[PDB]
């Protein structure tokens, strides 16, 4: 996260840290005691699916304070429409091997209904994006969880306010822009998979997933987030399904 602040410990209790062989991989969002939403692109280069760990209640990566809860990731579900190495349909649904225990430091973010998300949440201007990603473009990643408040743009506006780039990917109906074009504030590659959380009448909801962009906090460019509202029904149906052997599962989308 570039240009944000430390999220006070326990104020982003749905934030997930994903590790592979103990190394920082991506962020994620807890949506109930056994399910985490992250980005499909986080898994493009995994070879050993058995060493994927989700950590809840994490804040400071340098110390163990006892609020952290680690769980093995039993299943990674990706839409059939996602193509590794491309940007569209950038979402993954992870089933934890055992539920996390809800505490003051581990709480799920509400996965909203599609209608409520499209009709109401999509019109809330500012939302929070968080993670342990790069503090600067080509800089070190954060030891403490960072958070940034970003405004959402309508896609016509995003394309109009952005600097034209060669081979630049299209912003589809499964994405949305948020952030700033002045190069001061953005989410970064290490924040991939983390939440874009929106407040509405006293409750926070999942509206986006840190997905892609052109260099972190690059002048003339905004952050691009997966538009979670397009996946509510897909996510809900999978959460009612029985687990299947094998960690990776490709599930039909829609």
């Amino acid at each position: 996260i570039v240009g944000g602040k430390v999220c006070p410990k326990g104020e982003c209790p749905w934030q997930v840290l994903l590790l592979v062989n103990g190394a920082q991989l991506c962020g994620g969002t807890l949506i109930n005691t056994i399910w985490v939403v992250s980005a499909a692109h986080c898994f493009d280069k995994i070879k050993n699916w058995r060493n994927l760990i989700a950590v809840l209640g994490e804040h400071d990566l340098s110390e163990h304070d006892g609020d952290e809860q680690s769980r093995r990731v039993a299943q990674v579900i990706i839409p059939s429409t996602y193509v590794p190495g491309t940007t569209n349909h950038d979402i993954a649904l992870l089933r934890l091997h055992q539920p996390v225990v809800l505490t003051d430091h581990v709480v799920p973010l509400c996965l909203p209904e599609r209608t409520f998300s499209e009709r109401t949440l999509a019109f809330v201007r500012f939302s929070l994006v968080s993670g342990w990603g790069q503090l600067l473009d080509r800089g070190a990643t954060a030891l403490e969880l960072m958070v940034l408040n970003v405004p959402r743009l309508m896609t016509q506006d995003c394309l109009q306010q952005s600097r034209k780039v060669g081979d630049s990917p299209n912003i589809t109906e499964y994405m949305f822009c948020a952030g700033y074009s002045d190069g001061s504030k953005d989410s970064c590659k290490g924040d991939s998979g983390g939440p874009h959380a929106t407040h509405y009448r006293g409750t926070w909801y999942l509206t986006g997933i840190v997905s892609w962009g052109q260099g972190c906090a690059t002048v003339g460019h905004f952050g691009v987030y997966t538009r979670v509202s397009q996946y509510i029904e897909w996510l809900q149906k999978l959460m009612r399904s029985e687990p299947r052997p094998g960690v990776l599962l490709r599930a039909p989308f829609p």
């Binding site: 006070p8 949506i31 581990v106 709480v107 799920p108 009448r201 006293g202 409750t203 926070w204």
Partner: protein
Amino acid sequence: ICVNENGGCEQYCSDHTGTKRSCRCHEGYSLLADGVSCTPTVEYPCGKIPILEKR
């Protein structure tokens, strides 16, 4: 009704037979008698921050 100001609902809104509207809540919440407000029914409802709620 739901398209305009969330039909006055705190959380979810469903449109019915003509000018009828029913508000609903996420799991871990129940609807108050005002028909619009959602109150937690569990210790750790989704989307609420305990350290801020207890302060």
